[PDB]
Symmetry: C3
Subunit: 88 residues, 3 copies
């Protein structure tokens, strides 16, 4: 009262699983060898994710919902940044 | 309870974020310039989504769950229609 | 609290809708003709899914959360097998 969101890309593939548990959203990564803890760590009770490739460059969008409000987080190769998404 | 589902397609990309809040599911859209409110509006407490391309034409399937029942909604270019999906 | 997750692949397309309801996760499938009940059946309150292709062969990963623990399930052509995923 655990909630997950998953995305994958490429043919290896790379997989990312985001878990919202105890008011925190964390990330677990698979790139073909084993699972490791990712850099994503934001407060939230709910999470959704989508991702796309531009050649070999991955872009991830994580929608983290905390206390009635939804924040979009972007991964575009170098660090997680807050996105332009708003609910209204 | 906010609960979201997201899908994306193409290289721009186009992103669709569906939010179930206060018994209603609404849609926000990104097509490369800015976020705008989509046409989708159906009752529901939970939402999932998947999409696929047929060349450049998008097909979206939204699964909206409301009061114990799941209804599929289809976007195939010209309007949201009710899908053939049943749970059993 | 019905909670769903969806994935699709190819041009037909094939669609898989996973539903967590009454402490069980079941699967409904569409391969171009009609909806039918799939072999996936595991205990759980929450579910997410991701899939990818290697040619026309589908690989599906289902993340089933039951009583605080998340188990990854793999479909790689011949049966559902437990995956290496751990939360930590
Ligand atoms: Zn707990
Ligand atoms: Zn909280
Ligand atoms: Zn509220
Ligand atoms: Zn309701
Ligand atoms: Zn249970």
């Amino acid at each position: 009262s655990v909630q997950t969101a998953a995305t994958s890309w490429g043919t290896v593939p790379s997989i990312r699983v985001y878990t919202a548990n105890h008011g925190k959203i964390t990330e677990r990564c698979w790139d073909g060898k084993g699972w490791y803890t990712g850099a994503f760590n934001e407060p939230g009770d709910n999470v959704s994710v989508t991702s796309w490739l531009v050649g070999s460059a991955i872009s991830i969008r994580v929608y983290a919902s905390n206390h009635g409000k939804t924040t979009e987080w972007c991964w575009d190769g170098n660090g997680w940044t807050k996105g332009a998404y708003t609910a209204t």
